[PDB]
Ligand binder design. Structure first.
Ligand SMILES: *[C@@H]1O[C@H](CO)[C@@H](O[C@@H]2O[C@H](CO)[C@@H](O)[C@H](O)[C@H]2NC(C)=O)[C@H](O)[C@H]1NC(C)=O
Ligand SMILES: *[C@@H]1O[C@H](CO)[C@@H](O[C@@H]2O[C@H](CO)[C@@H](O)[C@H](O)[C@H]2NC(C)=O)[C@H](O)[C@H]1NC(C)=O
Ligand SMILES: *[C@@H]1O[C@H](CO)[C@@H](O)[C@H](O)[C@H]1NC(C)=O
Ligand SMILES: *[C@@H]1O[C@H](CO)[C@@H](O)[C@H](O)[C@H]1NC(C)=O
Ligand SMILES: *[C@@H]1O[C@H](CO)[C@@H](O)[C@H](O)[C@H]1NC(C)=O
Ligand SMILES: *[C@@H]1O[C@H](CO)[C@@H](O)[C@H](O)[C@H]1NC(C)=O
Ligand SMILES: *[C@@H]1O[C@H](CO)[C@@H](O)[C@H](O)[C@H]1NC(C)=O
Ligand SMILES: *[C@@H]1O[C@H](CO)[C@@H](O)[C@H](O)[C@H]1NC(C)=O
Ligand SMILES: *[C@@H]1O[C@H](CO)[C@@H](O)[C@H](O)[C@H]1NC(C)=O
Ligand SMILES: *[C@@H]1O[C@H](CO)[C@@H](O)[C@H](O)[C@H]1NC(C)=O
Lengths: 172, 98, 98, 172
């Protein structure tokens, strides 16, 4: 029942401006779920081999193309990080709210899988060590609500020539 | 006696009517919908304030300057994102008990 | 963009909750008889004040010092003259939105 | 009907510590009205001459003895200024109120008949020229109410080594 890709990895490291093309091929008629459009040819090429195939290709790939890529007919997920140098950071921008549930996640997405990175704001800098506040390369950092209530805005700070994303904060 | 009248007079001097930096809540300052957040919610401006030595006299402005400030306004639901707004706030420049 | 977030953040910083010199009306501060004049009527002390970013949170003192001040109290009728009185006023030294 | 003194003047210039003795003599049995007590012998000595006489005497006279002296049986008034060097100024002290009637008089009494003297307070100094605000040696200075309303206390300032009286102010 579950389909499979031409690259059996949950995390691919790609550079920007690099052409990327993968074949999701498994049983039934399939369709990719690559985030957005366009400049990327969508052609469903059969192959038989013991399944119907479908290929996804893209010539011009930069920062605004990094994301998750799923090929659902039991789904088949694979994340791809596209490294850029000019704009390593992707903001909302200016989109952030929260509900009292002890879970406040910040959506500041990272181009590179391994970074030493800290979140700063008006109220000093907040270092992630993993127990109360925890960093995650997949999307951003996780912080408890009642402690971050004190802060009004937030902005992820890096170590490179520095780059600062900038969402805000409104409590409920 | 001497030194006490001195200090007392100093207390008067220090507590006299004049413009003071205060934090004005913007929303409450224009009286907007109960569905708006301002960021920041408040701005620092100078307004006439202090204590008069009579009760029927109240500290009021006799001249006002105006300060342009720019901040952000969040509406609900999150249909759009925070938009930049320019607002003029009163900056009192002279006061009198009236 | 940049410079605007900068200034906005500066406005926040400038408008944050903290102790501020204010003029407290003594009579109204202890709630005395409506036949007393205080001279001076008001004293300058620091009290916790400013604006919180939530509504249900209110700026309160988490620690208070006390200042001795001496002033004069007039009663009515003019049976006696102004007598010296020593009074202690709160001088807030730290604040939190609670 | 009206009595007469041993010194027909409305203003006498005396120095402190100087013995002063005057004979009020006129018709009916008389009695002085010299301010207060004591250390001053009160003896009613008749003289005939064409009237009944009465003498008032005082050995120790300083500042706290300067004032008005009347001999009423048509009264007979005479003011006497007793010059002192240590305490040239007499305060209330701390006694001053006012009613809205355009007339606000300050009770700061002067030892010397001719002085250049100005009233000062928290709100600068107030110079007397005679039209709106006017100085009077007899008792003090006269000021309109709504203009002095701005000031909270008052204190007469002199030109000598300076001396400052100190009443207050409460408006109605
Ligand atoms: C806003 O108001 C303040 C008043 O607190 C102004 O700051 C100064 O106020 C003093 C009053 O003691 C004046 O003498 C000065 O002329 C003011 N300016 C300075 C710093 O010298 C301030 O200027 C006002 N801002 C404006 C221009 O609107
Ligand atoms: C009264 O309160 C004020 C607070 O405004 C005290 O002044 C200073 O406040 C700052 C807060 O930013 C402290 O860091 C200082 O330690 C305080 N003192 C100074 C001038 O260094 C003030 O001390 C208080 N007065 C007392 C002693 O009651
Ligand atoms: C299929 O996937 C491999 C990686 O597993 C990739 O190298 C190759 O280019 C892909 N073939 C195409 C372009 O269909
Ligand atoms: C990403 O998205 C915007 C959409 O208009 C595009 O203009 C921009 O050039 C893109 N970034 C790139 C390709 O560097
Ligand atoms: C990032 O910081 C960690 C802290 O332990 C360090 O071990 C690691 O070497 C750093 N990465 C660098 C500077 O290459
Ligand atoms: C204070 O007085 C001035 C006088 O011109 C006036 O223009 C200003 O609007 C007043 N401030 C107020 C009431 O906001
Ligand atoms: C502020 O808090 C302190 C905490 O000890 C308290 O002692 C003080 O009385 C408070 N100030 C008030 C409410 O006057
Ligand atoms: C009477 O008055 C004169 C001044 O007119 C004075 O010199 C004299 O001492 C007085 N006589 C007495 C002491 O009765
Ligand atoms: C004036 O009056 C008081 C009353 O007790 C007295 O003690 C004081 O010595 C007098 N001033 C003089 C005589 O210098
Ligand atoms: C007091 O001041 C007046 C001002 O005209 C002056 O004429 C007079 O000479 C002064 N008195 C003095 C200094 O003797």
């Amino acid at each position: 029942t579950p389909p499979t890709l031409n690259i059996t990895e949950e995390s691919h490291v790609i550079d920007t401006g690099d052409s990327l093309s993968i074949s999701c091929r498994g049983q039934h008629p399939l369709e990719w779920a690559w985030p957005g459009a366009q400049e990327a040819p969508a052609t469903g090429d059969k192959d038989s081999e013991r399944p119907y195939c479908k290929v996804l290709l893209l010539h011009e790939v930069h920062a605004n193309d990094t994301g998750s890529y799923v090929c659902y007919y039991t789904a088949a997920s694979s994340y791809v990080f596209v490294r850029d140098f000019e704009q390593p950071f992707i903001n909302k921008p200016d989109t952030l709210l929260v509900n009292r549930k002890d879970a406040m996640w910040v959506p500041c997405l990272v181009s590179i899988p391994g970074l030493n990175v800290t979140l700063r704001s008006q109220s000093s800098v907040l270092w992630p060590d993993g127990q109360e506040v925890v960093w995650d390369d997949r999307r951003g950092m996780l912080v408890s609500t009642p402690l971050l209530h004190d802060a009004l805005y937030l902005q992820c700070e890096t170590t490179w020539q520095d780059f600062l994303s900038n969402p805000f904060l409104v409590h409920i | 006696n001497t030194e006490i009248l001195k200090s007392i007079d100093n207390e008067w001097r220090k507590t006299q009517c004049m413009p003071r930096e205060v934090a004005i809540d913007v929303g409450k300052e224009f009286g907007v919908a109960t569905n708006t957040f301002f960021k920041p919610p408040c701005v620092s401006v100078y307004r006439c304030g202090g204590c008069c030595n009579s009760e029927g006299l109240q500290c009021m402005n006799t001249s006002t300057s105006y300060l342009s400030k720019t901040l952000f306004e969040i509406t609900v639901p999150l249909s759009q994102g925070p938009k930049p707004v320019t607002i003029s706030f009163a900056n009192h420049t002279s006061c009198r008990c009236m």
